[PDB]
Amino acid sequence: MNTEAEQQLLHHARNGNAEEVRKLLAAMARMEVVADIDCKGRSLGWTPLHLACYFGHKQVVEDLLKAGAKVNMLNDMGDTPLHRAAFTGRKELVLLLLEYDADSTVVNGSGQTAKEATHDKEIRNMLEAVERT
Template sequence: MKKIWGYWRKKDLLPFSSSIIPGTDRGHHGTNFKPGYHIRDKDLGEIHKAASVGSVAKTHQVLLLGKNGLNDKDKMNRTALHLACACGHAAVVAFLLERKCLLNLCDAENKTALMKAVECQEEECATLLLEHGADPNVVDVCGNTALHYAVLFQNVSLAAKLFSYDANIEARNQDDLTPLLLGIRERKRQIVEFLVKKEANIHAVDKMKRTALMLAINYECMDVVSLLLQRGADIFSQDVFGRTAEEYAVISGFKIQKEF
C-alpha cells in the first residue's frame, strides 16, 4: 500500500505554541533578528577598538605597547577575535590566530568567535577559525551550535564547512530542536534538503514530541513534506497531545489521498 498526500489549503493554520526563535539576541523574532554586535566605544578596550575597525597595524601596536593582552575581554565579555569575526575583518582574524589567541572563549551569551562568524555570514573568518582548530560544537546560552546559526541563515556552504570539521548534525538546543527541525520551523527549504541528504535524523522530535513531518505540515513546507515521506517519515507517531501527522494535516486543511 502506498500513501499519496494531496493537499489543498482550507483555512489558516492553527498556530503552534512556539517560543521565540532560539538563539536570537534580546528576544527578537527571526524576521527582525539582526546578527552582529552593538558596538560602543565605552565598552571596548584598545585592542577591541582596533579589531572592530579592521586595523591589523593598530592591533599589533596595542599588543606591543602592552595596552591590552591578546585574549582580554571587553565589558560585554568579547575578545578582539569575537569583534573581528563579527565585523568580517579576516586580516585581523588571521593576525590574531598567528599570535596564538584562544579560539573558544565565549562572550556574554556564551558564543564563540566561530558562532559570531557564522551568525554574521563571514565565511572567510569562519574558515580560518576552523582551520586553526575552533570547536564547532560549543553551545551558547540557548543551546545553539554554529550549525544552528548556519541553518537559521540558510547558508549551505557554511554548513558543509562545519560538517567537514565534525559539527554534530543532531545537536539539540534548549527547545530540543536539531538543526533539521529548526530549518523546517524557519521554512529554510534549501538547507533542510541539504541536511536530509546528509542523513540528518528525520524521526527526531522537539520537546513537544512533534516530528519533522508535523512541523513541515504546520509550516506549509510541502516540498519538505514530500521529501520526508519519500524518506520514510512516520505518519503515525504521536506528539504530547496524541496527534499524528495525519491529524495535523486535517487540522491544517490538507487533504490526504490514498492510492492502493
C-alpha cells in the same frame, strides 16, 4: 576595568584597523603595554577575536590567531568566535578558525551550535561535515 591598551585593542579590532592591532601586539610582545590578547569588553565578554570575526576584519583575525588568541573564548551569550563568523556568514573566516582548532561542537547559552545559528547554505554544509567528524 580593562587596561588602556586592552581598550585600544578592542576598539581597533572592532573597526578593522589592522596596523594598529599589529602595533599593539608588537608592543605587548616587547612588554611596553599591559594587555591580555583575550581581554573582554565590559559595560559583554567579547574578545578582540569575537569582534574581528563578527565584523569581518580578516587581517586582524589572522594576526590575532597568529599571536595566540584563544579560539573558543565565550562571550556572555556563550558564543564562540566561530558562532559569530557562522552567524554573519563569513566563509573564509569559518575556514580560518577551524584551521586554528576552533571547536564547532560548542553549544551557546541559547542551546545552539554555530551550524544551528547560521543562515548561509555553504557554511551550514561545511559545519554539517565537520560535525560528522
